[PDB]
Amino acid sequence: GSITENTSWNKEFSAEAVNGVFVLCKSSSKSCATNDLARASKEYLPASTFKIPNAIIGLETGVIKNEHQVFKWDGKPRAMKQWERDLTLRGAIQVSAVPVFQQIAREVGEVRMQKYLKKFSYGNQNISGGIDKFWLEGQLRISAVNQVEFLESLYLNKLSASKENQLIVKEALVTEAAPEYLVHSKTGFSGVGTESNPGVAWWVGWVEKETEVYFFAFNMDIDNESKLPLRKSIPTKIMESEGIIG
Amino acid sequence: SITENTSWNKEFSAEAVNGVFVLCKSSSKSCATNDLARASKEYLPASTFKIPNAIIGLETGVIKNEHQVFKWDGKPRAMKQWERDLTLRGAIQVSAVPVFQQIAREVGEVRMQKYLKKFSYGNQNISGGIDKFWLEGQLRISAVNQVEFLESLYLNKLSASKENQLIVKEALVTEAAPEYLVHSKTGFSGVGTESNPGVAWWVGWVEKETEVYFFAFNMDIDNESKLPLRKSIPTKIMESEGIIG
Ligand SMILES: *C(=O)[C@H]([C@@H](C)O)[C@H]1CC(SCCNC=N)=C(C(=O)O)N1
Ligand SMILES: *C(=O)[C@H]([C@@H](C)O)[C@H]1CC(SCCNC=N)=C(C(=O)O)N1
Ligand code: NA
Predict the structure, then answer these.
(1) Could you name the active-site residues (chain B) (predicted)?
(2) Are residues B40 and B142 in contact, defined by beta-carbon separation less than 8 angstroms?
(3) Residues of chain A contacting residue B85, judged by C-beta atoms under 8 Å apart
(4) Is the minimum CB–CB distance between B176 and chain A shorter than 8 Å?
């Protein structure tokens, strides 16, 4: 397990006047590279990336029955029209249907939710702030490095959850599929934050390319929703210039 | 039950293709096709056999697990794309025959026969050599049967652990989009011989919103230049029904 600083990559950040970090790890050499060692260890609210552990915990606790469970839309207004539908597990993840996962956390409960974030070594493991908000506005925080450790565990089925439930969540996280490579990933965006205290935007996941696997985690400060696409454009550019997905 | 849709014939005739498309919304209990007779006609599975072969490899422990790497011994293989180490998904996606031939040999005739019976896989005939019965032997399966088989897989209802079915299902993802996932497998038996065409396949399913469509396409083929039609005809149909694209 090694990490090195690669201040080169900074060009793709500077080009777009973005402050953030990319962490990219090659599984076979167990070696990671980042543009910013300090920021890679800095902990931010997970925002919708929390839907990964939350989904796993919901399956393990039985709250989510199985891979085919449909979360039925009860008709009442949701903060996004995208969310105003019936949704599969993948559907609710792809669209980041927060209220689906707020109810899941509610049924998981504080005690099991804390037990699992400790077993998963997930961030600071602080779920203070309300059972259906701690990852959105409460005290939970996780690093880019911790994300890639967590994702590597999931990939290897080594989290303290059934392998079946880890496989279920992995397939729901597939976002791009090609003959030579598969991408599993999850976006996050906490909001634009306050004056002097921007929000955070995330892109985490891993790339299966030939016999190699690359785990990655991107975060950036964000005070303008206009800039959201940059959470994929900068890591994708980085990953292309490494020959991984381009 | 299977019901004929005449409308779908346009895409075949335009291309001078003799083939069938089978499409089933939600379940295999009602399927639509351009050709009732051909929907249930049984053909060599060719590379589509990699799906049951992968499941059986896992169930028997021949494939140790999802992360197994099939190492290349460096000796010539029939396609340059196969001359590399491969994961399970990789070996499926490039249709690395010799990887699956060794799998078949290690599974062996007795176990292969048992699982094909459990899976209701076509005519369940594995004669013709343990490492080639799905390539040039007597094995045959229809488009309708592929749909039934894939539906069982999708539902984790094959006689196989849920874990192993999940592994193979992930290995079969070929298109991911926000609204839908496609799990699929292509096949091409070759160009056949005079008056006896080969067969080309595309089978799979589409998870879209909360709906699932099972599909199975085959055509006669005697010229490899026609091979792109195996995807474009069923894609065109599924795009015109509003399922993908
Ligand atoms: C998670 O990161 C959020 C969740 C908290 O809403 C979802 C929503 C979005 S983008 C729209 C949010 N607008 C806020 N004013 C994403 C995303 O990853 O793009 N995830
Ligand atoms: C399985 O259907 C075959 C396997 C038995 O060889 C592979 C090969 C091809 S096409 C490559 C060009 N063929 C030249 N002989 C496919 C395919 O799905 O297209 N699968
Ligand atoms: Na693909």
Answers:
(1) 47
(2) yes
(3) 210-211
(4) yes
Alpha helices in chain A (DSSP H): 10-14, 37-41, 51-60, 89-94, 98-119, 144-155, 163-172, 230-241
Q: Spell out which residues of chain A touch residue B210, defining contact as CB-CB under 8 Å.
A: 70, 86-88, 91
DSSP 8-state code for residue B242: T
- Phi, psi angle pair for B10, to nearest 5°: -50, -45
From B51, B186, B231, mutation site for ligand 2 pocket: most ligand atoms within 8 A of C-beta? B186
Domain of residue A65, CATH code: 3.40.710.10
Alpha-carbon torsion (A134, A140, A143, A146), positive or negative: negative
| CA A172 remoteness from chain centre | 13
Structure-token match 């699929």, residue found: B184
A176 close to B176: Cβ distance less than 8 angstroms: yes
- Interchain pair B181, A175: CB under 8 A: no
Name the residue facing A176 among B93, B166, B176 (closest C-beta).
B176
Q: Considering only CB atoms, which chain B residues are within 8 Å of A179?
A: 93-94, 174
Q: Compute, in angstroms, the gap from residue B94 CA to the centroid of ligand 2.
A: 8
Could you give the number of structural domains in chain A? 1
Q: How far is CA B164 from CA A191, A196, B66, B85, B87, in A?
A: 40, 50, 8, 21, 15
**Helices within A88-156 (DSSP H only):** 89-94, 98-119, 144-155
Helix (H, G, I), strand (E, B) or coil at A183: strand
Resolution in A: 1.9
**Which residues constitute the domain of residue B103?**
1-245
Residue among A145, A101, A106 nearest A122 (CA): A145
Q: Method of determination? A: X-ray
DSSP string covering A140-168: --EEHHHHHHHHHHHHTT-SSS-HHHHHH
